[PDB]
Every structure is written in C-alpha cells, then in structure tokens.
Design a protein around this ligand. Sequence first.
Ligand SMILES: [Cl-]
Ligand SMILES: [Cl-]
Ligand SMILES: [Cl-]
Ligand SMILES: [Cl-]
Ligand code: NA
Ligand SMILES: [Re]
Ligand SMILES: [Re]
Length: 129
Amino acid sequence: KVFGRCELAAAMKRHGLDNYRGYSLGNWVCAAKFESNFNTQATNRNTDGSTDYGILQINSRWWCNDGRTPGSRNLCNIPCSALLSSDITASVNCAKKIVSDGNGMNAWVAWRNRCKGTDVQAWIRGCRL
Ligand SMILES: [Cl-]
Ligand SMILES: [Cl-]
Ligand SMILES: [Cl-]
Ligand SMILES: [Cl-]
Ligand code: NA
Ligand SMILES: [Re]
Ligand SMILES: [Re]
C-alpha cells in the first residue's frame, strides 16, 4: 500500500509511536517519507547483500529473516516479508525494538540526514488525529 501522509500519521498514532522513547509523531512520518515514499512494498538491496524492507526500510542483517542474508540475525523474530504488509503492525513493533537499542532514530540514515533538527511537526500539520 502507498499511504497518505495523514493516513500514515493516524495509523502510527494508533500503534503507539506518538512520543515513543521521546519521538513525536512527525519524526516517524518524516522517516517513512524519505525511506519508503510511504510505500509499504518498497525493498532495496544493500552492498553487503542485506535488503531493506517496508515503510521504514528495516534491514535483514539484524532485524528480520529473508532466508538470503548469511550470517545474519533476526532480532525481531519475523520473516522480512511481513514488513511489506499494508497492515503496518509488524513494522511498528520492530521499529520500537530498533529505536530502543541505543542510537534512537539515528538507526535510520534518512531520519538523521533529513529529519533530525528540522521542524518535524510540519509533517502532521492539518491532520485529524
Ligand atoms: Cl511531531
Ligand atoms: Cl523504493
Ligand atoms: Cl538469512
Ligand atoms: Cl534517543
Ligand atoms: Na536476518
Ligand atoms: Re484505523
Ligand atoms: Re486516535
């Protein structure tokens, strides 16, 4: 599915990502925009042979099992393909685990480079929430 901005913000809020570990909702919407263009089906292969998956481009080296990244972990205990659903449940639950592990949202390159230190509340402006 390709989400609307306010459509995504409302789902993410329902899933408890507003202010999770300090991160207001706009941070998660911005990160999704720039990682996946709001597309749940987006996949991208990396130079090490892992693959990024889903609306938040969660990587197979450590977080999911895609059966094709050798020497990898599956710390969220899910097939990587679950991160491609239009239900964003598997992505949000595994993003919570990711954000909790030490670097916060710095774990996402596009958030660090494109959302950190910007007015991220603009990403939810004028949304019924
Ligand atoms: Cl916000
Ligand atoms: Cl893409
Ligand atoms: Cl694997
Ligand atoms: Cl943090
Ligand atoms: Na893996
Ligand atoms: Re909903
Ligand atoms: Re809500």
